[PDB]
Structure formats: structure tokens, C-alpha cells
Amino acid sequence: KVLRDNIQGITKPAIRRLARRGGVKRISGLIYEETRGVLKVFLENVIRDAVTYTEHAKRKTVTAMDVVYALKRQGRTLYGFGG
Amino acid sequence: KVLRDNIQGITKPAIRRLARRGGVKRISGLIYEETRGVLKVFLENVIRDAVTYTEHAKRKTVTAMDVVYALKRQGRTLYGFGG
Amino acid sequence: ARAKAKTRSSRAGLQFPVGRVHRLLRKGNYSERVGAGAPVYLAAVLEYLTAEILELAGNAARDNKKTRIIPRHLQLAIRNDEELNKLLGRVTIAQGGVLPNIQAVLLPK
Amino acid sequence: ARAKAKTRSSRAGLQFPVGRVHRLLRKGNYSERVGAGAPVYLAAVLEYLTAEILELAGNAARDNKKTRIIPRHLQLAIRNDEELNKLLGRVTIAQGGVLPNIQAVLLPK
Amino acid sequence: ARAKAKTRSSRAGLQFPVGRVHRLLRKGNYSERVGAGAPVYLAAVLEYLTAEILELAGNAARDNKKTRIIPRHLQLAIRNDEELNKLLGRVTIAQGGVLPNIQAVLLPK
Amino acid sequence: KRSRKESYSVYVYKVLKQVHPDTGISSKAMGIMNSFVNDIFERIAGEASRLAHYNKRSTITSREIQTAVRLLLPGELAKHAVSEGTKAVTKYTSA
Amino acid sequence: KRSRKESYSVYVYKVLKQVHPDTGISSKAMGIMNSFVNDIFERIAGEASRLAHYNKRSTITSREIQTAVRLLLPGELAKHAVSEGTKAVTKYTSA
Amino acid sequence: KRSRKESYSVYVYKVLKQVHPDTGISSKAMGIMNSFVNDIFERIAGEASRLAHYNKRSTITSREIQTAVRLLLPGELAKHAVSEGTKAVTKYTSA
Amino acid sequence: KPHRYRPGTVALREIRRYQKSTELLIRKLPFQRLVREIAQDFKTDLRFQSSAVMALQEASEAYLVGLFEDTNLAAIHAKRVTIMPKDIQLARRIRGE
Amino acid sequence: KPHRYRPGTVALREIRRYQKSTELLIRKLPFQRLVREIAQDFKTDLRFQSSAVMALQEASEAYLVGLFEDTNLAAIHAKRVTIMPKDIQLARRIRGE
DNA sequence: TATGTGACACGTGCCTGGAGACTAGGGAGTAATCCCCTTGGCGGTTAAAACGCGGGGGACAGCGCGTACGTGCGTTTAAGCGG
DNA sequence: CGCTTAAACGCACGTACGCGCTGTCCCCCGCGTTTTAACCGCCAAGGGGATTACTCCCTAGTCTCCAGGCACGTGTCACATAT
């Protein structure tokens, strides 16, 4: 239930996979934690938005339609979830 | 009637002034024409839409309020000319 | 006693539904009246765009010898058109991937 | 037999015109119906925002010993607040100038 | 008694006269009956090809800074589209002239 | 007893069959196309709404939609859309 | 007193202003279009007639002329002509 | 004279004298603040309209105004805007 | 001797693979667990559509991968092939994050 | 001896001065000439409000200046102080342009 | 190249949303005007641009170097799938 | 919860790569001078933006009725997987 450091649940080889899909050749060891913090900031922005939608929606559970509204609020529109 | 060359009217010392406002300490000689081209692209992108407003406003006089509309269309909203 | 039912989409000669787009625009609260040719024109524009991206997806599928459109083919079609890339520079696609693209300095020798 | 025509801004203890804002919302076509407390809440939020930005502008004008607020003071106020700058990063002020900013690598030894 | 006469050109919604083309095919001795949609198809493909060659001609005229198209524009347009050129290799245009074309060894040095 | 939900499925599937009779579809690609068609729909509709406000018109006409196409759609897609849509305006005008 | 003579001028003019409102036309270029539409007309017409003879079909339908335009016109122009004619004949089928 | 043109000058001046009786205002800064308040107003109105259609709400009320101002305003601005708005809503509730 | 590729060859092969491939680069269960971890901080006992977690997913690595070609452009601008987090900082700050 | 400042000193003083200043750095009437020249490329012989001209001048100068801070960030990120147009192209590519 | 399969795709009920008939009236098209705003142009002037010399500061190549990821192989466990 | 491997970790050895330093060359700002056209500023002119009126085109809305597109069920072959 109570969760502690799942930011490191995103593994370093997963980050290497992400860099290789971006075509990055060589990755420093300092990269992974800084990118974890960056994605943490990004996720907490979008989940703050999606949450705010959700308690406004009078639903207790998050729906993806709130999620896509949150992403188009941030100028980061994503296609393919009934939007 | 027609005009042929006014892109050079944005002179090199004007670019130098803007770069010092931009905090640039040292400016190459290759900078000025490329900035003229980039500025040309930005101005034509905004003025095409400003035109499109102006005939859509059925006017032949270009107004600043349409300039505001065009600039805020491209995420470049300017304060000081609305209304 | 009454005229036989004839769709306004066929009156435009168009496929996207004129009545549905008109209803969406009326209930979408953009103006309290709307010109009759406006949703017809709108459905025509979206039909043109849907058509052209559908041929582009068809060519991407045929080049990769798959009979059915895949969001990978949508990604490859949408990113390789600079017109459509500038149309959708901020748009992401689910399970789309990226262009196969490498920098020259990343290649050996 | 009408009572004295009292103002809703004073009813909410506010400066911004509640009636004008409600009129703009009713004619800005955002919904056909507007809840009564909504323009009040909006006008209060706007009053708080305008109050804090004008307070910052007055502080900046006082810092430059200037008794009448300046768009340069507006720029210096709006860009030196983190919440305001992240609120209004893509918004530009006319004749604002820029923030005084020189990189340390630009600075000499 | 009778409805208003609405043209088959309007029924297709295309500019080329359907009735004239049907009349010509009736009096041109190609079959003893003709399908109704075939001259519609004819008018459609003719208007498509005239539209594209008129695009080419208008583009050439704007390249030559002329408002009205001339046979030189027609020549330059019809010779630089390979499908049109090999469509009309043996077809000659009045006052068209020739393509600007010089062999490499004709050039000095 | 379940409620009906709106989709663009039959229309996109038909226009796929005219543009490519032999080419199939995956379902989540249709979801992406649904998102695209909806997205451009409120882009053009919001442009039409604000352009109607700017000229103080309470009626949005095909002129406004065409202006919105010229604004949001760049380059060639705008002019081909204008050509086919004005064509469609004449087509409905005949009806 | 004169005799009425057919021309394809006015339809070329509607098409021209549909595709280029800014562009004029010279009358002998109009005559060249007249020669064009006539020449392609009996090219396709003889193609349809001889195809109708090949399958001994005494009636020429849209399938026949589609076959003929696929024969003479090459590829890109052929397939987009197919698309134009196909949507035209479907909207006539609805008409 | 001419027709009346809307402005927010008097309210800006009143709020200015609430926060700074001592200082003055330039009318160009007044115009900038008019642009500011119009921009924020249309922003909040836009997302309120969005949220009204998201919950399919025919009436726009203050709760999604709260939602929108919490959405746009970062942190401290958002909570104290909620505080000021809630205070004024309660005072108008008490007339 | 056993076979051993020189540095960059396996990197090139996996770059080409993941450019061609579209499937997820993140293990799904710790991702969902992290989403619940972050969301619980803002509102308690938040339940998730799995599709919502997935949409959060493709939004996340889309943002990351875009930041990654930004980082790569910064690195080739700096005449390098090894990226450092200051490149990511530069990309975010020029984007304005 | 006629005094000569060491290079970049006057450049930094200009940086301080023009960061302090708020006015437009573009000549107004050549800017209007270029604006009308590009206007007739879309529609010939229009009229202009001068307010539109200063609005375009403000927006153009602001966009250029922000582009130069991005260029300066790229150049110092490449451990240089002299900018080249490659830096500007890099910044435009980061901005998504 | 061999093989299952479920996802795509297609027949079917329906009701519901969209079209047909008709109207009120009102926003919208149009005429007029005028005046104010915009364009056109003319003289003085100087700052602003431009141009030349110069000379230091910076870009960048060369070269090495030590290290820090790349690559490779063994393990754990933890992600992943079914129910 | 119960298997069930895939990959995450982890170590280990090797290379190549950021980077540190310097040589070197050249580029561009500092400064002074020349030109020049920008700009004030002034005035003439006219043009169309905007305003008022007037009448009307459409269209939003209401009632009727019906067919279209989506839910529903199903079957089936393009593709996933294996080799």
C-alpha cells in the first residue's frame, strides 16, 4: 500500500532502452537519476492535472479521458484513447 | 510601387544591439544574414495570418488588433496592444 | 405526403455526416447561429484530410508489405511529411515509435 | 417599488464589475447557463491576481524611486516571480526590456 | 405536374456537359446503347485532366509573370510532365515552340 | 441495456475503401484517427468561434471555416481543402 | 445569319476559375484545349467501342470506359482519374 | 461623441489605490493590464467551457472555475486565489 | 578467443532495433506502482484504469524520447558522443521546462 | 595616447546598457518598408496602422532576443563564447521549428 | 515456410438522430458618409550605418590519457501471465 | 497466488572519448571617419473604417417520420510465432 522509492523502479537498462530508441550512443552514469527526477516532475505535473479533473469529475478512480485532457492542457496531445 | 530589398534594412548594428540585449558577447560575421532569414520566416508566418484576418475582416487596412490575434495564435501573445 | 429521406452528405456529395457535424457544432457552443455551408465545408475539409492521410498510410503499409494500417505506419507516414510534421509537431501517437534516424557522427569511421 | 440598485461587486466586497464579467461570459459563448457565484468567484480571483501584480509593480517602481508605474517595472515584476513566469512564460510585454542577466562565463576574471 | 429541370452535370456536380457528351457518344457510333454512368465518368476524367494541365499552365504563366496563359506556357507545361509528355509525344501544339535544351558538349570548354 | 456511443468508424472505413480498397485497418489505429479527427474538429471550431467574435458575428459561415483552414492548415493542404470544399459548397448549393 | 458551332470554352473557363481565379486565358490556348478535349474524347470513345466489340458487349458502361482510361492514360494520372470518376459515379448513383 | 468602448481602467485604478495609494499609473501600463485581465479571463472561460462539456454541464458554475484556476495557477497563486474567491463567494452568499 | 563486439556496434544494433520496434521500454508493473505512489501523494486511494496508466506511459516516454534527441543534438553540438545531464538541463531550459 | 578598450569590455557594457534599456533597437521606417514588402507578397497595396508596425517590431525584437539567449546558452554549452549560425539552427530545432 | 488465432470485418436489430415542412425575425447584407486615419511628400539633421585598421581573444585542431561506460557472461528476482 | 523465465544486476576487462593543454591562425569588435537616410515635423489629400439605416435570407426551432450507424454476434484469414 504505502510506497517508497518506485522512482528507481524504472531501471537503468530501461533508461538505456529509452536512450537507444532516441538513438543516443553513449550514456553517462549521472544520466539516470537526473532523468528520473525530470520524469518525476513531468509525471507529477500531469497527474496533478488529471487528479484535479478527477475530483472535479466526482469520480474516485482516474480515467484516461482525464489523462488526455491533461496532456492537451500541456500542449502534449496524444492520440488513441477515445479522445 | 513595388519593393525589392528591405531585409537589409535590419542592419548589422541593429543585430548587434539585439544580441547585446540578448546577452551575446561575441557575434560571428555569419550571424547577420541567417538571423535576417530567420526573422524573415517569423515575420512572414505572422503576417500571412494577419493578412488572412484582414481580408476576413473585409478590410484593406491592416490593424494591430489582428496582429494581436495572429501573434496569440502562434503562442506568442503580446501585451500592450490588445484593444 | 412527405419527401423521401435524402442525406445532406449526399447533397454535398460527401461521406462525413453533415447532420452529425452540424449537431456537434450547435452543441459545441461556437456561435448561436451557424451558416448552412459551414459544416458542409468542414466535413469536406476533414474528409479531404482523412483521405490523404489514408493514402499515405496505405503507401507506408504497402512499402512494409502489410495489408492493414498499423500505428507504426501512421507514425512513419506522419513524420516523413514535412507539411504534416509541421501540422503535428506537438502531437504524439500511442505505440507509434519514431523515425529510424541516426546522426552521421554516430556512425563508425 | 424598486429597492436601491446595489452592486454585486460591493456585495462580494470587490472592485471588478460582477455584472460586466457575467455579461461577457453569457455572450462569450462558454455555456448557455452561468451559475450565479461563478462570475463572482472569477472576479475575485482576477482581483487577487491584479492586486498582487500591481503590488509587485509598485514595489519595483519604489525600488527605482519612480512614483508612476512603468512597463519596465511590469517586466521586472512579472519575470522575477517564479509562479508568474511559469504562468506567463510565452506571454510578452511591449517595451518591457529584458531581465538583467549575464552568464558567469560571460563575466571576466 | 413537372419538376424543375436539374442537369445531370449538376447531378454529378461537374462542369463538363453530361448531356452534350451523351449526345456525342450517341451520334459518334460507338455502341447501340451506352451506360448512363459512362459519360459521367468521361466528363469527370476530362475535367480532372484539364484541371491538372490548367494548374500546370497557371503555374508556368505565373513563372513567366503573365496573367493569361499562352501556348508557350502550354508547351513548357506539357513537355515537363512525363506522363503528359509520353501521353502526347506525337501531339503538336500551335506556336508552342520547344523546350530550352542544350547538350553538354555544345557548351564551351 | 447499454448506451450507444459515437464513433467515426463506418465513415473512415468507407473512405479507406475508396482511397485503398485492398488495405485493411487495425482498431487502435482507428482510435488514433478518431483522436485526430476530433482534435482538428475542435481546432477549426474554436478558430471559427473566435473569428466570429472578432468580427462580432453570431453566425459562423463557410467563410469563417475557410479562414480557419487558411490559418491552421499551412501550405498546400489549405488550398486543396479550399478547392474541394468550395466545390462542395457549390454541390450543396445545387441541392 | 450564322450557324451554331460547339465549343468547350465556357466549361474550361469555369474549371480555370475554379482552379486559378487569378489566371486569365488566351483564345487560341482555349482552342488548344478544345482540340485536346476533342482528341481525347474520340480516343477514349474508339477505345470503348473496340473494347465493346472484343467482349461482344453492345452496351458501353462505366466499367468499359474505366478500362479504357486505364489503358491509355498512364498510372498516376490514370489512378487519380479513376478516383475522380469513381466518386463522380457514386454521387451520381446517389443522384 | 462616439460609441462607448469598454475598458478596465477604473477598476485597475481602484485596486491600485487599494494596494498603493502613493504611486501613479501610466495609461500604456493600464492597457497592458487590460490585455492581462482579458487574457486570463478568456483562458479561464475556455477551460470552464471545456470542463462543462467534459461533465456535459449545461450550466457553468463556480466549482469548475475553482478547478480551472487550480489547474492554471501554480501553487501559492492557486490556493490564495481559491481563498479570495471562496471568501467573496461566501460574502455574496450572505448578500 | 571468444567473440566480442567493439563499443558502439551493439549500441548501433539496438538503436536500429528500438527505432524499428514500437513496444514498451518500461517494465509495466513498477511503472504502474510508481504512478500509484505519486498519485497517492495528491489524493488518497486512487484507483486506475489500466488504459489510463498506459496513456500516462506513452505520454511519459514520448516526452523522454523527445528530450533525448534534444540531448543528442546538444551532444553533437558539443562535438561529443557521451551525453551528460547538463545537456538534458539545457534542452529543458531552452524548451523552458 | 588615444585610449582603446580591451575587446569585449564595451560589449559587456552594451549588454548592461541594452538590458537596462527598454526601447526598440530596429529602425522604424526600414522595418515598415520590409513589413509592407512582405505584405504585398501576400496582398499588394494594403494600408497599415502604425500601431501594428510597432506591435510587429516589439514581437520580432522579443523573439529575436529570446532566440539569442537560447543561442548563447547553446554556445556556452559548447564551451564557446562566439556564436555561429549553427547554434541558431540548433536552438530552432530544439524549439520545434 | 509451416500453423493457429483472434481481430478485423461483415450481416443484423433498432431507435434515434437526422432529415422534411414551415415560420419569425433577426442577424446579416447593403447604401451612404465622413472624417479621421492613413498615405504621400518636402526640408534639416544628425545619429546611424557603413567602412577601414588593427590587434588581441577565441575557435579549433592535435595529441594524449585515464577513466568510465561497452560489452560480455553469470545470477536473482522480479516482472509477467493465468486464474 | 502460483509458476516461469527475462532481464536487471553485477563484476570484469578493455577501449575510446571527454577533456585538458597548447599552438596557431584568423575574426571580429574597438575606434575613428564618412556618409546617409531616419526622423521630426509639417502639411495636403484622400480613402476607407466605421457608423446609421433599411430591408431581407436564413436559420433556429418544432413536429413527423424514417433509415443509419452503432451495438451485437460471428466467422475467418493476415498476421504472430516457430524454425
In sequence order, what DSSP letters do the residues of B2-32 get, joined into one string?
-----GGGS-HHHHHHHHHHTT-SEE-TTHH
Distance from C-alpha of D25 to C-alpha of D34, rounded to nearest angstrom: 8
| A77 CB within 8 Å of a chain C CB | yes
Query: In C 49-68, which Cβ lie closer than 7 Å to strand L?
Result: 65-68
Nearest CA in chain A to F29: A80
**For residue F13, which amino acid is it?**
Y
Report the alpha-carbon angle D71-D76-D80, nearest 5.
145
E17 closest CA partner among E5, E8, E29:
E8
Beta strands in chain C (DSSP E): 33-34, 68-69, 92-93
Beta strands in B33-81 (DSSP E): 61-62, 78-79
Contacts of G43 (CB under 8 A, 6+ apart): G72
Enter the C-alpha cell of residue D95.
517595451
Distance from C-alpha of D35 to C-alpha of D40, rounded to nearest angstrom: 10
First to last CA, chain G: 40
Judge residue I22's burial from the number of C-beta atoms within 10 Å of its C-beta, 0-12 exposed, 13-18 middle, 19 or more buried: middle
Judge residue J42's burial from the number of C-beta atoms within 10 Å of its C-beta, 0-12 exposed, 13-18 middle, 19 or more buried: middle
Contacts of C63 (CB under 8 A, 6+ apart): none
Report all structural domains of chain F as residue ranges with CATH numbers, in order of start. Answer: 1-95 (1.10.20.10)
- Lookup: nucleotide whose C1' is closest to A32 CA: K69
Across the interface, whether the CB atoms of I19 and C100 are under 8 A apart is answered: yes
Distance from C-alpha of E95 to C-alpha of I85, rounded to nearest angstrom: 68
Distance from C-alpha of F31 to C-alpha of F33, rounded to nearest angstrom: 5
Nearest CA in chain J to D89: J66
Distance from C-alpha of G35 to C-alpha of E96, rounded to nearest angstrom: 14
Contacts of I11 (CB under 8 A, 6+ apart): A20, A25, A26
Across the interface, whether the CB atoms of B79 and H39 are under 8 A apart is answered: yes
* DSSP state at residue C57: H
Distance from C-alpha of A36 to C-alpha of A9, rounded to nearest angstrom: 10
Distance from C-alpha of H20 to C-alpha of J51, rounded to nearest angstrom: 31
Among candidates C98, C105, C108 on the partner chain, residue whose Cβ is nearest the Cβ of I19? C98
Show residues of chain D in contact with C31, CB under 8 Å: 29
Sign of CA dihedral I24, I28, I30, I32: positive
Distance from C-alpha of D38 to C-alpha of D36, rounded to nearest angstrom: 6
Show residues of chain H in contact with C28, CB under 8 Å: 53
Residue D80 CB: number of other CB atoms within 10 A?
A: 12
Across the interface, whether the CB atoms of H34 and B83 are under 8 A apart is answered: yes
Residue D47 CB: number of other CB atoms within 10 A?
A: 25
Across the interface, whether the CB atoms of D54 and H85 are under 8 A apart is answered: no
G10 closest CA partner among G29, G32, G30, G28:
G30
By DSSP bridging, strand I82-83 and strand A26-27 are parallel
> Which residues are bridge partners to J48 per DSSP?
B62
Contact call for residues B15 and B27 (beta carbons, < 8 A): yes
Contacts 24+ apart (CB under 8 A), E32-35: E32/G58, E32/G59, E33/G58, E33/G59, E33/G60, E34/G59, E34/G60, E34/G61, E35/G59, E35/G60, E35/G61, E35/G62, E35/G64
G14 closest CA partner among E14, E60, E46:
E14
What angle separates helix F62-72 from helix F75-94, to the nearest 10 degrees?
A: 160
By DSSP bridging, strand I47-48 and strand A78-79 are unpaired
Contact call for residues H41 and H6 (beta carbons, < 8 A): no
First to last CA, chain C: 83
Buried b (16+ CB within 10 A) or exposed e, J63-96: bbbbbbbbbbbbbbbbeeeebbbbbbbbbbebee
Show residues of chain D in contact with B75, CB under 8 Å: 90
Q: Which domain holds residue J3?
A: 1-97
Taking domain B1-83, whether its CATH number is 3.40.50.10330 is answered by no
Distance from C-alpha of J58 to C-alpha of J36, rounded to nearest angstrom: 16
Cα–Cα distances (Å) from F89 to C41, F67, F81, I32, in that order, read 6, 15, 12, 50
Distance from C-alpha of H78 to C-alpha of D47, rounded to nearest angstrom: 13
Contact call for residues D96 and D72 (beta carbons, < 8 A): yes
Buried b (16+ CB within 10 A) or exposed e, I41-76: eeeeebebbebbbbbbbbbbbbbbbbbbbbbbbbbb
Residue with cell 461566501: H90
Contacts of C40 (CB under 8 A, 6+ apart): C8, C12, C14, C18, F62, F88, F89, F92
Which nucleotides in chain L have some atom under 7 angstroms from a protein Cβ? 7-9, 14-19, 27-32, 37-39, 48-52, 58-61, 65-72, 78-79
Sign of CA dihedral J22, J26, J27, J29: negative
Residue with cell 537503468: A12
Distance from C-alpha of F21 to C-alpha of B4, rounded to nearest angstrom: 51
Contact call for residues A76 and C90 (beta carbons, < 8 A): yes
Method of elucidation = cryo-EM
Across the interface, whether the CB atoms of I19 and C92 are under 8 A apart is answered: no
Beta strands in chain H (DSSP E): 24-25, 59-60
Enter the C-alpha cell of residue D79.
519575470
Residue F62 CB: number of other CB atoms within 10 A?
A: 23
List the alpha helices (DSSP H) in chain G: 9-19, 27-54, 62-72, 75-94
List the alpha helices (DSSP H) in chain D: 8-11, 18-27, 37-63, 71-80, 82-87
Chain D (39-98) residues lying within 8 Å, Cβ to Cβ, of chain J: 71-72, 75, 92, 94-98
Contacts of J2 (CB under 8 A, 6+ apart): none
Count of structural domains within chain I = 1
| E10 CB within 8 Å of a chain F CB | yes
| Residue J39 dihedral angles phi and psi, to the nearest 5° | -65, -45
Q: How far is B40 from chain F (nearest CA, A)?
A: 17
Contacts of I12 (CB under 8 A, 6+ apart): C102, C106, C107, C108
Q: Which chains does B contact via 3+ CB–CB distances below 8 A?
A: D, F, H, J
Residue E89 CB: number of other CB atoms within 10 A?
A: 8
By DSSP bridging, strand F24-25 and strand C68-69 are parallel
Q: How far is H91 from chain A (nearest CA, A)?
A: 23
Resolution in Å equals 5.0
| Residue C65 dihedral angles phi and psi, to the nearest 5° | 50, 30
Contact call for residues E16 and E48 (beta carbons, < 8 A): no
Enter the C-alpha cell of residue J65.
532576443
Contact call for residues H12 and H33 (beta carbons, < 8 A): yes
Distance from C-alpha of E103 to C-alpha of J69, rounded to nearest angstrom: 52
Judge residue B7's burial from the number of C-beta atoms within 10 Å of its C-beta, 0-12 exposed, 13-18 middle, 19 or more buried: middle
> Which residues are bridge partners to A27 per DSSP?
I83
Across the interface, whether the CB atoms of H60 and D38 are under 8 A apart is answered: yes
Distance from C-alpha of H47 to C-alpha of B67, rounded to nearest angstrom: 24
| F7 CB within 8 Å of a chain C CB | no
Q: Which chains does F contact via 3+ CB–CB distances below 8 A?
A: A, B, C, D, E, G
Among candidates F50, F55, F71 on the partner chain, residue whose Cβ is nearest the Cβ of B52? F71
Contacts of A6 (CB under 8 A, 6+ apart): I30, I33, I34, I37
Distance from C-alpha of G84 to C-alpha of F18, rounded to nearest angstrom: 10
Show residues of chain H in contact with D64, CB under 8 Å: none
Cβ of residue F10 near strand L, that is under 7 Å?
Answer: yes
Residue E72 CB: number of other CB atoms within 10 A?
A: 18
Show residues of chain B in contact with D103, CB under 8 Å: 23
Distance from C-alpha of D78 to C-alpha of A21, rounded to nearest angstrom: 39
Distance from C-alpha of G41 to C-alpha of G26, rounded to nearest angstrom: 22
Judge residue G86's burial from the number of C-beta atoms within 10 Å of its C-beta, 0-12 exposed, 13-18 middle, 19 or more buried: middle
F36 closest CA partner among C24, A79, A69, A66:
A79
Residue H9 CB: number of other CB atoms within 10 A?
A: 13
Nearest CA in chain I to A61: I47
| Residue H25 dihedral angles phi and psi, to the nearest 5° | -130, 140
Contacts of I91 (CB under 8 A, 6+ apart): I67, I70, I71, I74, J94
H33 CA → L17 C1’, Å: 54
Cβ of residue F6 near strand L, that is under 7 Å?
Answer: yes
Contacts of J29 (CB under 8 A, 6+ apart): none
Distance from C-alpha of J89 to C-alpha of J85, rounded to nearest angstrom: 6
Across the interface, whether the CB atoms of F60 and C74 are under 8 A apart is answered: no
- Lookup: nucleotide whose C1' is closest to C70 CA: L79
First to last CA, chain F: 40
| Residue E51 dihedral angles phi and psi, to the nearest 5° | -65, -45
- Backbone angle region of C58, left / alpha / beta, with phi > 0 → left and psi within -120 to 50 → alpha: alpha
Across the interface, whether the CB atoms of A75 and C90 are under 8 A apart is answered: yes
Sign of CA dihedral F25, F28, F32, F38: positive
**Chosen from G84, G86, G89, G91 to mutate, greatest number of chain C CBs within 10 A:** G91
Distance from C-alpha of F64 to C-alpha of F78, rounded to nearest angstrom: 14
| D101 CB within 8 Å of a chain J CB | yes
Distance from C-alpha of C46 to C-alpha of F81, rounded to nearest angstrom: 9
| G91 CB within 8 Å of a chain C CB | yes
Element (H, E) at J52: helix J50-77
Report the alpha-carbon angle C102-C107-C105, nearest 5.
80
Which nucleotides in chain K have some atom under 7 angstroms from a protein Cβ? 7-9, 16-21, 27-29, 37-39, 48-50, 55-60, 68-73, 78-81
Residue I4: alpha-carbon gap to chain centroid: 27
Judge residue H58's burial from the number of C-beta atoms within 10 Å of its C-beta, 0-12 exposed, 13-18 middle, 19 or more buried: exposed
Distance from C-alpha of H71 to C-alpha of A47, rounded to nearest angstrom: 11
Contact call for residues I91 and J74 (beta carbons, < 8 A): no
**Chosen from E8, E10, E16, E54 to mutate, greatest number of chain F CBs within 10 A:** E10
**For residue A17, which amino acid is it?**
R
Half-sphere exposure of J53 (CA within 13 A, CB side): 19
Q: How far is D98 from chain H (nearest CA, A)?
A: 16
Cα–Cα distances (Å) from B1 to B8, B44, G22, in that order, read 19, 20, 20
Among candidates I36, I82, I92 on the partner chain, residue whose Cβ is nearest the Cβ of A3? I36
Half-sphere exposure of E16 (CA within 13 A, CB side): 25
Across the interface, whether the CB atoms of B52 and F51 are under 8 A apart is answered: no
| Residue C36 dihedral angles phi and psi, to the nearest 5° | -65, -35
Contacts of D34 (CB under 8 A, 6+ apart): D22, D25, D26, H59, H60, H61
Contact call for residues G84 and E45 (beta carbons, < 8 A): yes
